[PDB]
């Protein structure tokens, strides 16, 4: 069902939260080799999450589930905010700009925390 597809999507999102917090600890410790690998792992996780979310939105549209479509349109828009911040973080790491990396890291945390009430609303709407 679309609801179980969203639970699978939610788990992938939680996998990225876990890897992100490990990556933050590695960044603070200066373990740049670990950070590089975690950033690659996060990129793959966000790509998978994005695709699952798009399939869920398209299915809600085909089902005529207007409220779930509204919420998923809002949620995917916020997802792209987080994705843009993530890509800027990756670039900051490439460039050796730790000041920007720290900034983007905190921003991605706040964007993600804000979007959690909506994430829960979607589970209930589908």
Site residues (CB under 6 A) for ligand IEJ? 46, 78-79, 82-83, 86, 108, 111-112
Minimum gap (Å) between residue 91 Cβ and ligand IEJ: 13
Instruction: Find the shortest distance in angstroms from Cβ 19 to ligand IEJ.
Output: 10
3-state class percentages of the chain: helix first, strand second, coil last, to nearest 5: 90, 0, 10
Q: Give min distance, CB of 110 to ligand IEJ, in A.
A: 9
Q: How far is CA 100 from the centre of its chain?
A: 19
Q: Which is nearer to ligand IEJ, 7 or 62 (CB)?
A: 7
**Cα–Cα distance, 113 to 3 (Å, whole number):** 22
Please provide residue 114's backbone torsions phi and psi, each rounded to the nearest 5 degrees. Answer: -60, -45
Which residue, 82 or 92, has its beta carbon nearer to ligand IEJ?
82
């Amino acid at each position: 069902s679309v609801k179980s597809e969203y639970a699978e999507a939610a788990a992938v999102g939680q996998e990225a939260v876990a890897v992100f917090n490990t990556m933050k600890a590695a960044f603070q410790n200066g373990d740049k080799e670990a950070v590089a690998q975690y950033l690659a792992r996060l990129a793959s996780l966000y790509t998978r999450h994005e695709e699952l979310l798009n399939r869920i939105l398209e299915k809600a549209r085909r089902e005529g589930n207007k409220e779930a479509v509204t919420l998923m349109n809002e949620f995917t828009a916020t997802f792209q905010t987080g994705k843009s911040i993530f890509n800027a973080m990756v670039a900051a790491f490439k460039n050796g700009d730790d000041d920007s990396f720290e900034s983007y890291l905190q921003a991605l945390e706040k964007v993600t925390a804000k979007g959690e009430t909506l994430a829960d609303q979607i589970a209930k709407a589908l």
